[PDB]
């Protein structure tokens, strides 16, 4: 019952012939899976730890200058030399000043001058990298039972926490009373940590692209250095000034922390204080429900009186949740729950807390059901004291279809081709679609990498216009489709 | 000579006394006493409840 109260909850119904299903777990999202004869389960990816990170480069965001020295040659005598031009902890510059009898040369002209200052770092960014085999994903499996200790809670009293690694990617969770669930995950295709850097600047951290991190215009150390003193692009944090041609000075360029923050827009912030914790990204797992059984199917209907201790409350997903207590005699018993019409002639809705059962008498159990659009009645108990609860669902079936399609499009926009593994049960249509999406996404990422969202919108409009003003129908339709998809992606992206 | 100050920008700041308040769904906006003071930079957002 953990996914109740999360806006990004997903409902996965059905398994394949093998009693397995493909689910992609995202950090901010919850997945609830349902099969014809299995307990309802909630899946949450609650952690992603990167372990044993290695630095590959330390950038300097704030430096200072000291030990400034200058050399000069009187005109026509070539460029001057300083001992510090060979010292790597010094930043040097060559210029021309004006010399003459007043300055102390004896020839009139442009005499070369060089000034050097010792470059020191005061604050840096350590861009650690981690091996893709050091990633660890923690996934909580909570049975959607109705027992009070799991109604939207973010604790582990009833939820079972299974840790998944690239090495041990197949694990099973023992769910007391429901058998076991086997998770066959593929963390290696999850986020591709070999092309990413863990960027820790001060008390804030980000997950960034390794090419972007290696292209930064700041000075850097290789990460194997323990003393600094060999910064590479020291010229990026200094400026040499020769106003007119009378002096050459050199100054540092002030703390770059805020410029780095601006540069980090579009990078998902992570945590790196007490280990490298990443609360972003997804994990594709194949869920095996074959050894998964409903708890209490060998129970008798309660035949007693229920009381609604908490009124029926609607969630963001079109389902409803109701908390009922039991006051009858057969303690462990199946709860007689139905969602019918007023005349109780038809069954209109399905319950999500499949097989609700009263484990204890004065122990409230809260059922989740999905009632139909419009009027429906929740009937709890049997005739001697049966309670009938009116409910009204405000939406529409066409609106629900539109929202489902939009969620599908957004999943494709965020997971790309991994969205074809969400709720997948094999099938040839799914495989064909995933292959086509893989090829098209390769082309699209090649053509749109490094482009902002405004540029994507502009390109989409341009391509759509080209297609619309196209004489051939096939090329017209293809370009219009590409342009509309480009526009949707530009409107959905955060870039 | 005799310059007059036109405007003072901030290039480095610190944040303190962070507080939050929330309003349950459909019940309007929440309120902090700190929104009265201009020394506080406040932000309104929506949170799953």
């Amino acid at each position: 019952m953990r996914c109740i109260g999360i806006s990004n909850r997903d409902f996965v119904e059905g398994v394949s012939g093998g009693s397995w299903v493909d689910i992609v777990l995202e950090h901010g999202s919850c997945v609830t899976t349902m099969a014809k004869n299995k307990p309802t389960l909630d899946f949450e990816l609650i952690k992603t730890e990167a372990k044993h990170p290695a630095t590959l480069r330390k950038y300097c965001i704030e430096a200072k200058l000291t030990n400034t020295t200058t050399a000069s040659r009187c005109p026509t005598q070539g460029e001057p030399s300083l001992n510090e031009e060979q010292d790597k902890r010094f930043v040097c510059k060559h210029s021309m000043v004006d010399r003459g009898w007043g300055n102390g040369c004896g020839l009139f002209g442009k005499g070369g001058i060089v000034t050097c200052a010792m470059f020191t770092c005061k604050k840096n960014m350590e861009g650690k990298i981690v091996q893709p085999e050091n990633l660890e994903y923690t996934i909580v499996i909570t049975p959607h039972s109705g027992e009070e200790n799991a109604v939207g809670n973010d604790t582990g009293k009833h939820g079972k926490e299974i840790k998944v690694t690239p090495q041990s990617s197949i694990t099973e969770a023992e769910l007391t009373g429901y058998g076991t669930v086997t998770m066959e995950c593929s963390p290696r295709t999850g986020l591709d940590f070999n092309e990413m850097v863990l960027l820790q600047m001060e008390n804030k951290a980000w997950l960034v692209h390794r090419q972007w991190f290696l292209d930064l215009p700041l000075p850097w150390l290789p990460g194997a250095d323990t003393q600094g003193s060999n910064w590479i692009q020291k010229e990026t944090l200094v400026t040499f000034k020769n106003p007119h041609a009378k002096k050459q000075d050199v100054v540092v360029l002030g703390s770059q922390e805020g410029a780095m923050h601006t540069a980090l827009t579009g990078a998902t912030e992570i945590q790196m204080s007490s280990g490298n914790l990443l609360f972003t990204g997804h994990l594709k797992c194949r869920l095996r429900m074959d050894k998964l059984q409903l708890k209490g199917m060998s129970y008798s209907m309660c035949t007693g009186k229920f009381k609604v201790v908490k009124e029926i409350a609607e969630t963001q997903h079109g389902t409803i949740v109701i908390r009922v207590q039991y006051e009858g005699d057969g303690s462990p018993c199946k709860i007689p729950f139905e969602i019918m019409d007023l005349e109780k002639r038809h069954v209109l809705g399905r319950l999500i807390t499949v097989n609700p059962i009263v484990t204890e008498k004065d122990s409230p159990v809260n059922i989740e059901a999905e009632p139909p659009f419009g009027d429906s009645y929740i009937i709890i108990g049997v005739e001697p004291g049966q309670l009938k609860l009116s409910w009204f669902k405000k939406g529409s079936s066409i609106g629900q279809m539109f929202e489902t399609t939009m969620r599908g499009a957004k999943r494709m926009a965020i997971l790309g081709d991994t969205a074809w593994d969400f709720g997948s049960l094999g099938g040839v249509f799914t495989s064909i679609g995933k292959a086509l999406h893989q090829v098209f996404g390769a082309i699209y990422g090649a053509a749109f990498s490094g482009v902002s969202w405004t540029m994507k919108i502009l390109i989409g409009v341009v391509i759509t216009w080209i297609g619309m003003n196209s004489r051939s129908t096939s090329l017209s339709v293809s370009l219009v489709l590409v342009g509309v998809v480009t526009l949707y992606l530009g409107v959905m992206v955060q870039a | 000579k005799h310059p007059a100050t036109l405007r003072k920008y901030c290039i480095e700041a610190k944040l303190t006394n962070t507080t939050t308040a929330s309003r349950c769904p459909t019940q309007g906006e929440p309120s902090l006493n700190e929104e009265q003071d201009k020394r506080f930079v406040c932000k309104h957002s929506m949170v799953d409840r």
Partner: antibody
Framework: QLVESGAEVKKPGSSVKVSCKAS????????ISWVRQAPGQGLEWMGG????????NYAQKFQGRVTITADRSTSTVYMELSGLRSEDTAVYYC??????????????WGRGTLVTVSS | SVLTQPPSASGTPGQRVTISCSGS????????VYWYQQLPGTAPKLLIY???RRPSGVPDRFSGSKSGTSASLAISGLRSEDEADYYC???????????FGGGTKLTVLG
């Protein structure tokens, strides 16, 4: 751990603010409630707050008279009483419970701050 | 409607005593009931939470009872330590707040 501010002596019509610092885990994963006990009397719940979320809930008796606030930077929970009177003399406790609307077990309590209106 | 308890309760060492917490369906019978043991000059100690549940580290002599609208707390064996005020707390839906039992002091003899 739940540490409360020291005892305070006030006067009628004045105000007293009681603080209750808490650890990081208990601040961001739990809720803090305020319960008073007048000497020789039963506990009385005044209100509480989910410090991560704010927006305190107040008992009807103390509605308009109390203000519970949480300082996220210092991970401290504050309680302020306005219009103090003799009948408001009592020891005030800050207690920790889960941040769920159904479970109200205060498994961890502060020592308790006593507010008096006399010398 | 609100929680009500006997103001005082007597007993003898090595006895069984049950304290009753009576409320309306709004507070007791529609929500959990919590029992707190407070010693003189000390913050109350959580004794029973939810219903008939004992927090880890509490002796088994304490047992809570929940009826359709009323609740009780029973003590297995009595001692001088049991002499203390006992409160029952329960969320009230109509009052929109937590209501305490009002107190019940166990007066062990001897």
């Amino acid at each position: 751990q739940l540490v409360e501010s020291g005892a305070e002596v006030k006067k009628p019509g004045s105000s007293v603010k009681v603080s209750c610092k808490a650890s990081g885990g208990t601040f961001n994963n739990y809720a803090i409630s305020w319960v008073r006990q007048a000497p020789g009397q039963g506990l009385e719940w005044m209100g509480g707050i989910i410090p991560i979320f704010g927006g305190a809930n107040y008992a009807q008796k103390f509605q308009g008279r109390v203000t519970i606030t949480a300082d996220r930077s210092t991970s401290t929970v504050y309680m302020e009483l306005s219009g103090l009177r003799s009948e408001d003399t009592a020891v005030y406790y800050c207690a920790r419970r889960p941040q769920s609307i159904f479970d109200w077990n205060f498994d961890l309590w502060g020592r308790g701050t006593l507010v008096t209106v006399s010398s | 409607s609100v929680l009500t308890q006997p103001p005082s309760a007597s007993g003898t060492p090595g006895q069984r005593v049950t304290i009753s917490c009576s409320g309306s369906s709004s507070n007791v019978g529609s929500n959990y009931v919590y029992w707190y043991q407070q010693l003189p000059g000390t913050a109350p100690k959580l004794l029973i939470y939810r219903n008939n549940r004992r927090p880890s580290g509490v002796p088994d002599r304490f047992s809570g009872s929940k009826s359709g609208t009323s609740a009780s707390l029973a003590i297995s064996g009595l001692r001088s330590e049991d002499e203390a005020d006992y409160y029952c707390a329960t969320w009230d839906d109509s009052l929109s707040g937590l209501v305490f039992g009002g107190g019940t002091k166990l007066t062990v003899l001897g």
